[PDB]
Design a protein around this ligand. Sequence first.
Ligand SMILES: [Ca+2]
Ligand code: NA
Lengths: 125, 161
Amino acid sequence: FIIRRKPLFYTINLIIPCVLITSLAILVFYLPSDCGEKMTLCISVLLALTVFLLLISKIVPPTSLDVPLVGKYLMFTMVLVTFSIVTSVCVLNVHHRSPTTHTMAPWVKVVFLEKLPALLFMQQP
Amino acid sequence: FIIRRKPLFYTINLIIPCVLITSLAILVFYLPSDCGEKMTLCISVLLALTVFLLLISKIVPPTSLDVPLVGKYLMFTMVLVTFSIVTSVCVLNVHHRSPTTHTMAPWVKVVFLEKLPALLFMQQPSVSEDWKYVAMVIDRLFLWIFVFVCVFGTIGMFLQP
Ligand SMILES: [Ca+2]
Ligand code: NA
């Protein structure tokens, strides 16, 4: 019995929400550190991805023979979002530094204030 | 009937999310107190660990003969995260102290502003800023403690596979 699933229903109800949630995984790096909302954003994205992964596993259970590509994508994005949480913690720590508590090494200057911005087309005013 | 489980499904569905969540259990101590988001992170980690523990409880039989090693690790991590929440509350309280409202004892000076920073390799480069530095020394101290206590946690989890 060769049968071919009609994919519109699951497309609409699973793939589009998953794509929408995944698209938000990168916005934490454009959010300014002064807003005080980076952690909320990345943690919410991770929670949504985890819930979607568990639901997918309930619908189509992954197995050693084959893992759904959608589940694999969700897991990869979950790992990326955890990495983004770590990176945002580090960036927030760097942002809230003052001469009264930290001293900037000369190499930090020559790299981050001079060279790296040039590669990224930033040009500190 | 000696049967062996194929662990891929539960690996993907419980282990990887659990380790991903646990890897965030020590970040609260590297988070500046001015970001105003230590509580968010630590509370989120605690609740995520609790949810996964409850899911595991729903999977395994409700028998009291033995405890899953993964459940044991989750319980240990939740205890650690609760300790970290308490420590973060204390550090936040310390950070927001000012000369008008609090007076800093001489022993607090000689300890936190002089001795401990040397031990932790901090090297301090107005009085309100001293309170802020004390809070930064306290959570640096616990960052070392949790790393050692957590890194030795892998020993417990390295005997399961
Ligand atoms: Ca806020
Ligand atoms: Na919530």
